[PDB]
RNA sequence: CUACGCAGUA
RNA sequence: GGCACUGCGUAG
């Protein structure tokens, strides 16, 4: 029958299915089933789970059993395999030692170890001097890695004598340096992973070494207690009075990071205040049973509950719309976007969604090649460090974060901070780590779902330093046209048409494809955020040294990845994800999206049978991909360029931080040479730990229809100046709901109303070209209502209701 | 400049205010217990805080954790000193019962002092 | 269509309830919020009327 | 080009 | 009472 094999020879290379005591299944079957996951064909996974008593037959009759979000209990079922997997690891090491004692030079593949852990194969082995034969275990461990943390194989290391029946290990409560334990863990399990492993990423050679060591530490940090991770404090004496100040940090991925300027100055006052050490040290203990998230302290005597008010209602606009025939029974245009109110327990319930974030150990060789390829998408932009006087801030009347919001807005801090002080703080962050506290506040906005949304306001120090670090690259990305990332490209004045024409650039059999990320801001693995930060920091080869770049990465990890959440008046620890109030949320999201797409393409090309490929060039590309992925250590720039050109030709992407429109060769995807929805679903399952459903993904066959939805806009082909141009229109329900329901009563009457509707009439003009009549009448409704507002309030303003003002907004003149 | 001076004074005052709230009786002991002198932040309240706040969403968790007037947590014996509801109104220990559970405004904030 | 104006009346009812300082009580505010959200997300007109009558009775209690 | 206010998008 | 981008609005 069909069995999964990891094959590499002169003809074919890849991890693919082939037609070809000893158990029925092998470890490669488990890895393939958990990596290339399709709910339509889940048989092999089902007998794997049932045979080894991970669950019962009746379990799969439950709907959405595979989904992580819908059925978190599956995290238990997979965990039942973990110990078995752990045993395999041990046996593997023994096997390696045996080969080293027999002078055997061989390559270890997943498809030669049954699920009992035994190795039943001895082919491709060549004798050498006894005591010297070296195994090759790059592909084995690299492919096995995601299953190590999907099944939680190392949980048995949390008990005394590594025995499940025995109780937990009572680690010293004051212990924070677990380096020796990390060495022991690496020595028992990954003994023959010959690349050097540094538990503390301070001692890493470059970005790739940082990624490799962090990948190991993410797995190794699950054993240790969660109270040890976080800022390391010290009791110092200033002006003759004691203080508690953080003199380091303990990252689950970067190990122990000690500051270099530990000394025991408005800049130093900010460094002290932003530190959570002083706030948590004086705070009372907290036990918040509402969430499974670890709690730190309660900064106030009473817990605070924040409620979301119901949105106001515009009787004037609704009455006008009803008088014109809108909101009629059976109409195609209805109200589906409302202001949803929430009770006092909404904020903590939203914060509880971080339980979807899990410790994910990415495939290290695949991730390294993928970051190499993703770096090609950012070779056109330029970035570097900038001085305090070159930093541009959009608005200074926003919140300055906690605890700085007790004293003033960000304008006050930017005014008090002289340019020399800002530069001194920025140079300080390159040597030391400044942990910060970020507030989460319920957001008040239109939605079509009743789930609450929160925003993570970050402190002023993190904002300032991250701006000085990243603003040059951010403004370079936002000012580039015709690239993969379309951030900063205006949809107006023919921008949508230009973007779509760029996406359709010379694809042989073009089909459009689009997807969405479930719980993107809550379920993103820490490794992918670290890799995105490293990619955004790759522009600093000439301005920052190795130590400066590493300490900047550590600062970003401490102030984004492992934040202190000031939720409802209490301090919690964020397991991971991304902060919606971060400085580089959109760009890191774009890097992560491109990473996921490239990973899907690599998986699709490697999982192809290879022998059935009719193109010599594609087969050679696949063979070189495998030998540069799991067999080549240093970066091969020639093949990276070749594969990047291959993707750019056959897989054209338009990415805005979550929204991806892909123009792909239909024939190549059909043969399996290019990623499809199934590949993205598999990648999200085994990397992002979220099940992607077919309801949130779309595919388009005819390009004249355009993308089904990009940035919540639909695309249609219309006539302008004897030219067929692509024109985007929004949901009429969204526009009508925005008109009917305003944020506060101040926007229910007055001059401001006009401006509001004008903007809406700018966004909902294209509906006039829609074949459906109600959509076309929406814009005329808005125009007539704006005319009525002009009549009520009261020749320059006469342009507001004439259609030419909005006609000009979608012509390529400007 | 005036805003800068006022904010410097305010932040110094707030740091000092947290300082006066900080008790060295257990912090010094745990600091000297460590050989390096650095301790994780997350274990400072777990070993030096005198007051504990527990938020109870449902009666099952209340019975599991702090059913009586005195319970144990973080390897320390805590004694209940106050119980309030989501309206910040005092709720007596006898008021909390399975029969009276629908009448209570959950969640319940119970404040205890170390023993 | 009665669905639309029922939804609008439910929105204004919850707004006036909030203006009546009903959000001080946890249970009453939670019930009102759940009723209003269910009304807005409902697709049955009769169910919308039933929940709106329940919310209006809650308002009429005080 | 600057200040302010609003709208849309993630 | 968060970031980034685009577009309008009144003032030079
Ligand atoms: Zn390293
Ligand atoms: Zn730099």
**Do residues A532 and A591 touch, judged by C-beta distance below 8 A?**
yes
Return phi, psi of residue A600, to 5°: -65, -40
Statement to judge: residues A228 and A274 lie in one domain: yes
Contacts of A492 (CB under 8 A, 6+ apart): A809, A810
**Do residues A433 and A547 touch, judged by C-beta distance below 8 A?**
no
Give catalytic residues of A, as residue numbers. Answer: 657-659
Statement to judge: residues B33 and B59 lie in one domain: no
Q: Please report the sign of the dihedral spanned by the C-alpha atoms of residue A55, residue A61, residue A67, residue A70.
A: negative
Q: Annotated binding site for Mn(2+): which residue ranges of A?
A: 112, 121
Extract the runs of DSSP E, i.e. beta strands, from A276-356. 285-288, 295-298
User: A206 CA to middle of ligand 1, Å?
Assistant: 8
| Gap from C33 CA to chain B (nearest CA, Å) | 15
Statement to judge: residues B77 and B108 lie in one domain: yes
DSSP string, A240-266: TEEEEEEEEEEETTTEEEE-S-----H
Quickly give A491 CA vs E8 C1' distance in Å.
14
Residue A63, burial from CB neighbour count under 10 angstroms (0-12, 13-18, 19+): exposed
C-alpha to C-alpha distance for A301 and A284, rounded to whole angstroms = 8
C-alpha to C-alpha distance for A798 and C35, rounded to whole angstroms = 44
Statement to judge: residues B80 and B114 lie in one domain: yes
Among the listed residues A347, A330, A243, the one whose alpha carbon sits nearest the alpha carbon of residue A290: A347
Q: Please report the sign of the dihedral spanned by the C-alpha atoms of residue C54, residue C55, residue C58, residue C59.
A: negative
Count CB-CB contacts under 10 A for residue A87: 15
Residues in C touching B87 (Cβ below 8 Å): 24-26
C-alpha to C-alpha distance for A579 and A182, rounded to whole angstroms = 29
**DSSP label of A285:** E
Name which of B56, B58, B87, B109 to mutate to probe chain C: the one with the most chain C Cβ atoms within 10 A of its Cβ. Answer: B87
Out of B8, B18, B39, whose CB is closest to A233? B39
Quickly give A490 CA vs E5 C1' distance in Å.
8
Instruction: Please name the residue that has the structure tokens 């036990």.
Output: A287
Three-state secondary structure along chain B?
Answer: CHHHHHHHHHHHHHHHHHHHHCCHHHHHHHHHHCCCCCEEHHHHHHHHCCEEEEEECCHHHHHHHHCCCEEEECCEEEEEEEEECCCCCECCCCCCCCCCHHHCCCCEEEEEEEC
Out of A327, A334, A338, whose CB is closest to C40? A338
C-alpha to C-alpha distance for C58 and C62, rounded to whole angstroms = 8
In Å, what is the CA distance from A291 to each residue of A68, A218, A352, A526, B107?
18, 23, 6, 21, 12
Q: What 3-state DSSP class applies to A208?
A: helix
DSSP H helices in A131-177: 138-150
Statement to judge: residues B72 and B42 lie in one domain: no
Cα A330 off chain centre by: 41
Contacts of A554 (CB under 8 A, 6+ apart): A201, A249, A251, A254, A257, A433
DSSP string, A537-568: TTT-TTTS-HHHHHHHHHHHIIIIIT-EEEET
A584 in contact with nucleic chain E (CB within 7 A): yes
Q: Which two tokens stand for residue A517?
A: 């990320």
Residues in B touching C26 (Cβ below 8 Å): 85-87, 105-106
For chain C, the residue count is: 62
In a domain, A794, yes or no: yes
Number of structural domains in chain A? 3
Facing residues of B52 across strands?
A: A285, B112
Number of structural domains in chain B? 2
Q: At what angle do helices A585-607 and A364-376 cross, to 10 degrees?
A: 120
Among the listed residues A636, A644, A597, A595, the one whose alpha carbon sits nearest the alpha carbon of residue A376: A644
**Do residues A317 and A740 touch, judged by C-beta distance below 8 A?**
yes
What is the longest distance spanned by two Cα atoms in chain B?
62
Q: Single out the residue in A267, A283, A299 at which a domain terminates.
A: A283
Strand D nucleotides, any atom under 7 Å from protein beta carbons: they are 2, 4-10
Secondary element (H or E) of residue A588: helix A585-607
Which letter, b or e, does each residue of A483-512 get, where b requires 16 or more Cβ atoms within 10 Å of its Cβ? bbbbbbbebbebbbbbbbebbeeebeebbb
C-alpha to C-alpha distance for A778 and A757, rounded to whole angstroms = 12
Statement to judge: residues A219 and A272 lie in one domain: yes
Domain that holds residue B1: 1-48
Q: Which two tokens stand for residue A232?
A: 């390391």
Quickly give A711 CA vs E4 C1' distance in Å.
15
Residue A30, burial from CB neighbour count under 10 angstroms (0-12, 13-18, 19+): buried
DSSP string, A486-517: -TT--STTTHHHHHHHHHTTT-SSEEEEEE--
| CB contact (8 A) between residue B105 and residue C27 | yes
**Do residues A586 and A657 touch, judged by C-beta distance below 8 A?**
yes
Count CB-CB contacts under 10 A for residue A20: 8
Statement to judge: residues A24 and A133 lie in one domain: yes
**DSSP label of A289:** T
Q: What 3-state DSSP class applies to A640?
A: helix
User: A561 CA to middle of ligand 2, Å?
Assistant: 20
Q: At what angle do helices A460-478 and A266-274 cross, to 10 degrees?
A: 90
Contacts of C10 (CB under 8 A, 6+ apart): C35, C36, C39, C40, C48, C51, C52, C55
C-alpha to C-alpha distance for A97 and A104, rounded to whole angstroms = 10
Q: Which two tokens stand for residue A21?
A: 């005591």
**Do residues A305 and C23 touch, judged by C-beta distance below 8 A?**
no
Instruction: Please name the residue that has the structure tokens 């050097």.
Output: A196
Solved with: cryo-EM
Q: Does A266 touch chain C (CB under 8 A)?
A: no
CATH number for the domain spanning B109: value is: 3.30.70.3540
In a domain, A456, yes or no: no
Among the listed residues A110, A252, A89, A91, the one whose alpha carbon sits nearest the alpha carbon of residue A186: A89
In a domain, A104, yes or no: yes
D5 nearest neighbour residue (CA to C1'): A752
- Nearest nucleic acid nucleotide to A763, CA to C1' distance: D8
Quickly give A756 CA vs E8 C1' distance in Å.
9
C-alpha to C-alpha distance for A323 and A454, rounded to whole angstroms = 37
**Do residues C22 and A296 touch, judged by C-beta distance below 8 A?**
no
Q: Please report the sign of the dihedral spanned by the C-alpha atoms of residue A777, residue A780, residue A785, residue A788.
A: negative
Statement to judge: residues B41 and B73 lie in one domain: no
Statement to judge: residues B32 and B61 lie in one domain: no
C-alpha to C-alpha distance for A88 and A95, rounded to whole angstroms = 10
Among the listed residues A199, A180, A781, A276, the one whose alpha carbon sits nearest the alpha carbon of residue A558: A276
Q: What 3-state DSSP class applies to C58?
A: helix
C-alpha to C-alpha distance for A154 and A563, rounded to whole angstroms = 26
Q: Single out the residue in B33, B48, B63 at which a domain terminates.
A: B48
Domain that holds residue A250: 179-183+195-283
Which letter, b or e, does each residue of A722-759 get, where b requires 16 or more Cβ atoms within 10 Å of its Cβ? eeebbbbbbbbbbbbbbbbbbeeeeeeeeeebbebbbe
Statement to judge: residues A121 and A199 lie in one domain: no
C-alpha to C-alpha distance for A499 and A492, rounded to whole angstroms = 11
Q: How many helices (H) and strands (E) does chain A have?
A: 28, 19
Statement to judge: residues B28 and B54 lie in one domain: no
C-alpha to C-alpha distance for A227 and A173, rounded to whole angstroms = 8
| CA terminus-to-terminus distance, chain C | 30
Q: Which two tokens stand for residue A799?
A: 């342009």
**Do residues A305 and A312 touch, judged by C-beta distance below 8 A?**
no
Facing residues of A513 across strands?
A: A662, A699
C-alpha to C-alpha distance for A531 and B78, rounded to whole angstroms = 45
Omega prior to A223 cis, within 30 of 0: no
Statement to judge: residues B26 and B80 lie in one domain: no
Which letter, b or e, does each residue of A377-411 get, where b requires 16 or more Cβ atoms within 10 Å of its Cβ? bbeebebbbbebeebeeeeeebbbbbbbbebbbbe
Quickly give A641 CA vs D3 C1' distance in Å.
47
Statement to judge: residues A145 and A11 lie in one domain: yes
Chain A, chain B: beta-carbon pairs less than 8 Å apart: 162
Q: What 3-state DSSP class applies to A132?
A: coil
Contacts of A495 (CB under 8 A, 6+ apart): A489
Secondary element (H or E) of residue A231: strand A230-238
C-alpha to C-alpha distance for B84 and B88, rounded to whole angstroms = 5
Break chain C into its structural domains and give their ranges: 1-62
Facing residues of A4 across strands?
A: A17
Statement to judge: residues A148 and A8 lie in one domain: yes
Omega prior to A403 cis, within 30 of 0: yes
**Do residues A328 and A266 touch, judged by C-beta distance below 8 A?**
no
Residues in C touching B91 (Cβ below 8 Å): none
**Do residues B66 and B110 touch, judged by C-beta distance below 8 A?**
yes
Q: Which two tokens stand for residue A332?
A: 């195609």
Cα A288 off chain centre by: 28
User: A473 CA to middle of ligand 2, Å?
Assistant: 11
Q: Which two tokens stand for residue C20?
A: 């009546």
Secondary element (H or E) of residue A511: strand A510-515
C-alpha to C-alpha distance for A655 and A373, rounded to whole angstroms = 16
Contacts of A308 (CB under 8 A, 6+ apart): A340, A341, A342, A346, A442, A444, A452
C-alpha to C-alpha distance for A58 and A76, rounded to whole angstroms = 16
Q: Which two tokens stand for residue A734?
A: 């969204």
**Do residues A353 and A456 touch, judged by C-beta distance below 8 A?**
no
C-alpha to C-alpha distance for C42 and C45, rounded to whole angstroms = 8
Among the listed residues B7, B38, B19, the one whose alpha carbon sits nearest the alpha carbon of residue A269: B7
- Spell out where chain B is interrupted, by the residue before each break (C to N > 2.5 A): none
Residues in C touching B86 (Cβ below 8 Å): 26
C-alpha to C-alpha distance for A565 and A94, rounded to whole angstroms = 45
In Å, what is the CA distance from A247 to each residue of A250, A299, A432, A571, B86?
10, 22, 8, 20, 38
**Do residues A231 and B39 touch, judged by C-beta distance below 8 A?**
no
| Gap from C28 CA to chain B (nearest CA, Å) | 10
C-alpha to C-alpha distance for A320 and A318, rounded to whole angstroms = 5
Among the listed residues A240, A279, A232, the one whose alpha carbon sits nearest the alpha carbon of residue A257: A232
Statement to judge: residues B101 and B78 lie in one domain: yes
Q: Which two tokens stand for residue A282?
A: 């004086």
**Resolution limit in angstroms?**
3.3
Instruction: Please name the residue that has the structure tokens 């892909």.
Output: A662
A309 in contact with nucleic chain E (CB within 7 A): no
Secondary element (H or E) of residue A272: helix A266-274
A395 in contact with nucleic chain D (CB within 7 A): yes
C-alpha to C-alpha distance for A539 and A542, rounded to whole angstroms = 8
In a domain, A552, yes or no: no
**Do residues A590 and A655 touch, judged by C-beta distance below 8 A?**
yes
Q: Which two tokens stand for residue A513?
A: 């494809």
Name which of B88, B102, B105 to mutate to probe chain C: the one with the most chain C Cβ atoms within 10 A of its Cβ. Answer: B105
**Do residues A697 and A600 touch, judged by C-beta distance below 8 A?**
no
**Do residues A401 and A457 touch, judged by C-beta distance below 8 A?**
yes
Statement to judge: residues B71 and B29 lie in one domain: no
Statement to judge: residues B56 and B105 lie in one domain: yes
Q: Please report the sign of the dihedral spanned by the C-alpha atoms of residue A806, residue A807, residue A809, residue A814.
A: negative
User: A234 CA to middle of ligand 1, Å?
Assistant: 27
Count CB-CB contacts under 10 A for residue A808: 13
Q: Annotated binding site: which residue ranges of A?
A: 112, 121, 198, 204, 209, 213, 385, 540, 543-544
DSSP H helices in A672-768: 677-683, 732-740, 751-763
Statement to judge: residues A257 and A212 lie in one domain: yes
In Å, what is the CA distance from C44 to each residue of A79, A595, C32, C56?
43, 44, 19, 18
Determine how β-strand A437-442 pairs with β-strand A564-567.
parallel
Contacts of C58 (CB under 8 A, 6+ apart): C17, C28, C31, C32, C35
Count CB-CB contacts under 10 A for residue A237: 9
Count CB-CB contacts under 10 A for residue B34: 16
User: A380 CA to middle of ligand 2, Å?
Assistant: 18
**DSSP label of A686:** I
Q: Nearest ligand, CA of residue A210?
A: 1
In a domain, A10, yes or no: yes
A472 in contact with nucleic chain E (CB within 7 A): no
**DSSP label of A268:** H
Cα A296 off chain centre by: 26
**For C25, nearest residue in chain B (alpha carbons):** B87
Q: Which two tokens stand for residue B60?
A: 């099952």
């Amino acid at each position: 029958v069909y069995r999964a094999f990891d094959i590499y020879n002169d003809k074919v290379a890849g991890f693919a299915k082939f037609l070809k005591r000893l158990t029925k299944y092998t470890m490669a079957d488990l890895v393939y089933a958990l990596r290339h996951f399709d709910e339509g064909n889940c048989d092999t996974l089902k007998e794997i789970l049932v045979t080894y008593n991970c669950c019962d037959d009746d379990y799969f009759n439950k709907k959405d059993w595979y989904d992580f979000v819908e059925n978190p209990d599956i995290l238990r079922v997979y965990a039942n395999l973990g110990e078995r997997v752990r045993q395999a690891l041990l046996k593997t090491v023994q096997f390696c030692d045996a080969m080293r004692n027999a002078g055997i030079v061989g390559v270890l593949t997943l498809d030669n170890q049954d699920l009992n852990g035994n190795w039943y194969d001895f082919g491709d082995f060549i004798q050498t001097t006894p005591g010297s034969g070296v195994p090759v275990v790059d592909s084995y461990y690299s492919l096995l890695m995601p299953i190590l943390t999907l099944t939680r194989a190392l949980t048995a290391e949390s008990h005394v004598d590594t025995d499940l029946t025995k109780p937990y290990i009572k680690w010293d409560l004051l212990k924070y340096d677990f380096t020796e334990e990390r060495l022991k863990l690496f020595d028992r399990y990954f003994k023959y992973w010959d690349q050097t492993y540094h538990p503390n990423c301070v001692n890493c050679l470059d970005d790739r070494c940082i990624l490799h060591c962090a990948n190991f530490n993410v797995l190794f940090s699950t054993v240790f207690p969660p109270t040890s991770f976080g800022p390391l404090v010290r009791k110092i004496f200033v002006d003759g009075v004691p203080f508690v100040v953080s003199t380091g940090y303990h990252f689950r991925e970067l190990g122990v990071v000690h500051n270099q300027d530990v000394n025991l100055s408005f800049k130093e006052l900010l460094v002290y205040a932003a530190d959570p050490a002083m706030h948590a040290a004086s705070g009372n203990l907290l036990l918040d049973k509402r969430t499974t998230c670890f709690s730190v302290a309660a900064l106030t005597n009473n817990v605070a509950f924040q409620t979301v008010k119901p949105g106001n209602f515009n009787k004037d606009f609704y009455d006008f719309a009803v008088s014109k025939g809108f909101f009629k029974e059976g109409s195609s245009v209805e109200l589906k976007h409302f202001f949803f109110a929430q009770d006092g327990n909404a904020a903590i319930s939203d914060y509880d969604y971080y339980r979807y974030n899990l410790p994910t150990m990415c495939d290290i060789r695949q991730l390294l090649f993928v970051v190499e390829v993703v770096d090609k998408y950012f070779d056109c932009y330029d970035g570097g460090c900038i001085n305090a006087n070159q930093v541009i801030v959009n608005n200074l009347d926003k919140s300055a974060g906690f605890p700085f919001n007790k004293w003033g807005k960000a304008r006050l801090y930017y005014d008090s901070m002289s340019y020399e002080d800002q530069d001194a703080l920025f140079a300080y962050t390159k040597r030391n780590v400044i942990p910060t506290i970020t507030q989460m506040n319920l957001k008040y906005a239109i939605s079509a779902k009743n789930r609450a949304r929160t925003v993570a306001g970050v402190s002023i120090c993190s904002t300032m330093t991250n701006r000085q670090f990243h603003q040059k690259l951010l403004k370079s990305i936002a000012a580039t046209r015709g690239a993969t990332v379309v951030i900063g490209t205006s949809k107006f004045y023919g921008g949508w048409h230009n973007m779509l024409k760029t996406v359709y650039s010379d694809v042989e059999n073009p089909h459009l494809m689009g997807w969405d990320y479930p719980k993107c801001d809550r379920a993103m693995p820490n490794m992918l955020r670290i890799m995105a930060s490293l990619v955004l920091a790759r522009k600093h080869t000439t301005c920052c040294s190795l130590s400066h770049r590493f300490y900047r990465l550590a600062n970003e990890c401490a102030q984004v990845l492992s934040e202190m959440v000031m939720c409802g008046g209490s301090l919690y620890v964020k397991p991971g994800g991304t902060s919606s109030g971060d400085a580089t949320t959109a760009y890191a999201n774009s890097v992560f999206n491109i990473c996921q797409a490239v990973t899907a393409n690599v998986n699709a090309l490697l999982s192809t049978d290879g022998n059935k490929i009719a193109d010599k060039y594609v087969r050679n590309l696949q063979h070189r991909l495998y030998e540069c992925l799991y067999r080549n250590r240093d970066v091969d720039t020639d093949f990276v360029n070749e594969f990047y050109a291959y993707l750019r030709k056959h897989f054209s992407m338009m990415i805005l931080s979550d929204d991806a429109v892909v123009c792909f060769n239909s024939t190549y995807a059909s043969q399996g040479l290019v990623a499809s929805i199934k590949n993205f679903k598999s990648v999200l399952y085994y990397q992002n730990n979220v099940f992607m459903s077919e309801a949130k993904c779309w595919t388009e066959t005819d390009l004249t229809k355009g993308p089904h939805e990009f940035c919540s806009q639909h695309t249609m082909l219309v006539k302008q100046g004897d030219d067929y141009v692509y024109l985007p229109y929004p949901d009429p329900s969204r526009i009508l709901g925005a008109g009917c329901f305003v944020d506060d009563i101040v926007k229910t009457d007055g001059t401001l109303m006009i401006e509001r509707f004008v903007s809406l009439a700018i966004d909902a003009y294209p509906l006039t070209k829609h074949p459906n009549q109600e959509y076309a009448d929406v814009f005329h409704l808005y125009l007539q209502y704006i005319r009525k507002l002009h009549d009520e309030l009261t020749d320059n303003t006469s342009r507001y209701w004439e259609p030419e003002f909005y006609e000009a907004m979608y012509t390529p003149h400007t | 400049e005036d805003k800068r001076a006022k904010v410097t004074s305010a932040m110094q005052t707030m740091l000092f205010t947290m300082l006066r709230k900080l008790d060295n009786d257990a912090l010094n002991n745990i600091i000297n217990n460590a050989r390096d002198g650095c301790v994780p932040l997350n274990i400072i309240p777990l070993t030096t805080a005198a007051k504990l706040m527990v938020v109870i969403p449902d009666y099952n968790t209340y019975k599991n954790t702090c059913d009586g007037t005195t319970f144990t947590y973080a390897s320390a014996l805590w004694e209940i000193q106050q119980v309030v509801d989501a309206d910040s109104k005092i709720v007596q220990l006898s008021e909390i019962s399975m029969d009276n559970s629908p009448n209570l405004a959950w969640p319940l904030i119970v404040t205890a002092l170390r023993a | 269509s009665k669905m639309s104006d029922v939804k609008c009346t439910s929105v204004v009812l919850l707004s006036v309830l909030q203006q009546l300082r009903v959000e001080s009580s946890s249970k009453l505010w939670a019930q009102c919020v759940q009723l209003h959200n269910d009304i807005l997300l409902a697709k049955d007109t009769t169910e919308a009327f039933e929940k709106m009558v329940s919310l209006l009775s809650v308002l009429l209690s005080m």
